[PDB]
Write an enzyme that holds these catalytic residues in place. Sequence first.
Site, PDB file in Angstrom:
ATOM      1  N   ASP A 153       1.020  -1.073   0.003  1.00 10.86           N
ATOM      2  CA  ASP A 153       0.288  -0.290   0.033  1.00 10.86           C
ATOM      3  C   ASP A 153       0.856   1.103   0.049  1.00 10.86           C
ATOM      4  O   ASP A 153       1.692   1.839   0.464  1.00 10.86           O
ATOM      5  CB  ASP A 153      -0.765   0.370   1.373  1.00 10.86           C
ATOM      6  CG  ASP A 153      -1.858   1.505   1.407  1.00 10.86           C
ATOM      7  OD1 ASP A 153      -1.993   1.702   0.258  1.00 10.86           O
ATOM      8  OD2 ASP A 153      -2.823   1.131   1.877  1.00 10.86           O
ATOM      9  N   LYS A 205       0.034   4.619  -1.104  1.00 10.12           N
ATOM     10  CA  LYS A 205      -1.027   5.252  -0.382  1.00 10.12           C
ATOM     11  C   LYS A 205      -0.249   6.601   0.502  1.00 10.12           C
ATOM     12  O   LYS A 205       1.279   6.084   1.162  1.00 10.12           O
ATOM     13  CB  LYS A 205      -2.013   5.349   0.661  1.00 10.12           C
ATOM     14  CG  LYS A 205      -1.502   5.317   1.935  1.00 10.12           C
ATOM     15  CD  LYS A 205      -2.970   4.882   2.772  1.00 10.12           C
ATOM     16  CE  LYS A 205      -2.877   4.560   4.708  1.00 10.12           C
ATOM     17  NZ  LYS A 205      -4.108   3.955   5.018  1.00 10.12           N
ATOM     18  N   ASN A 224       1.765   6.940   3.777  1.00  8.31           N
ATOM     19  CA  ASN A 224       2.428   5.570   4.235  1.00  8.31           C
ATOM     20  C   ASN A 224       4.279   5.608   3.822  1.00  8.31           C
ATOM     21  O   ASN A 224       4.548   4.782   4.082  1.00  8.31           O
ATOM     22  CB  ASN A 224       2.382   4.436   3.946  1.00  8.31           C
ATOM     23  CG  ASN A 224       0.657   4.013   4.054  1.00  8.31           C
ATOM     24  OD1 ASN A 224       0.421   3.957   5.407  1.00  8.31           O
ATOM     25  ND2 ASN A 224      -0.047   2.598   3.851  1.00  8.31           N
TER      26      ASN A 224
END
Length: 278
Positions: free
Chosen positions: A122, A124, A127
């Site tokens: 992930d 995103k 992060n």
Amino acid sequence: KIRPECFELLRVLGKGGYGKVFQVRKVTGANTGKIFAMKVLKKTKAERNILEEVKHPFIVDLIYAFQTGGKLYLILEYLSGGELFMQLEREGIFMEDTACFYLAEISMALGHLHQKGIIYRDLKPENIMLNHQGHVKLTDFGLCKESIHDGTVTHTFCGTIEYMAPEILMRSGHNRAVDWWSLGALMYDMLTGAPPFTGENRKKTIDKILKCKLNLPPYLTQEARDLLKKLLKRNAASRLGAGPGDAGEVQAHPFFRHINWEELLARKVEPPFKPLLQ
Ligand SMILES: c1ccc2[nH]c(C3CCN(c4ncnc5[nH]ncc45)CC3)nc2c1
Ligand SMILES: [Zn+2]
């Protein structure tokens, strides 16, 4: 002999149901006065093992680990540059050179992870942290940072799924190819202001991601458009990076042609933004 008493708490960096992260100051030892991030977990084994196994400029360093009482303590380097998210939010859309820098550093971190059999899943932009110089640090190796949780079991759908690959969402089995998809979603977000597939609700967002009908904004360079096209594909095996060459494949793409990887890795390339100047 490290114990919780060796650190003083300065402020909360984050809290969820599965841990809390503090900025702390070491007050004993040769590192007296030095600032760290302290993550406290209620005993996870994957997280510690991952952080102990990886060593790379664009991945957060684990300095100490110990367990007292029922708690696990992870002492990490303190990253003062904030989330990549915050730069995107301030800038609206990155210029391509800006995006290129971040994506290039991320690709090296992904390469390192994959060599260690680790999948990030992930990307995103919350992060991804920046260190004090403005260079990338991957940080998200723990179970879940949320406070409200999707599913009474596993933590895939707890936060936004807008940067996760179709095959993750379908739970139909996956591999390191999901990271190259996610790099594309992040890239798309950088260059256009939003991730590629967004719906009015969760159900609609899932369906859009599964259908994967990509809209390539015409104002992007051909190199950027071609890379996005090759990352955001429903067929995992046919994404750039999914093959044996992994990160090398992605890094060879013309969108990154101006990158000196040796200089990048050594962090001798100047970041587009300097957190100390903010
Ligand atoms: C549970 C709930 C909320 C959370 N927010 C995190 C983030 C918080 C900010 N991070 C860091 N900040 C500064 N130095 C840092 N060094 N290492 C990390 C780090 C990154 C992680 N982890 C959580 C776990
Ligand atoms: Zn969760």
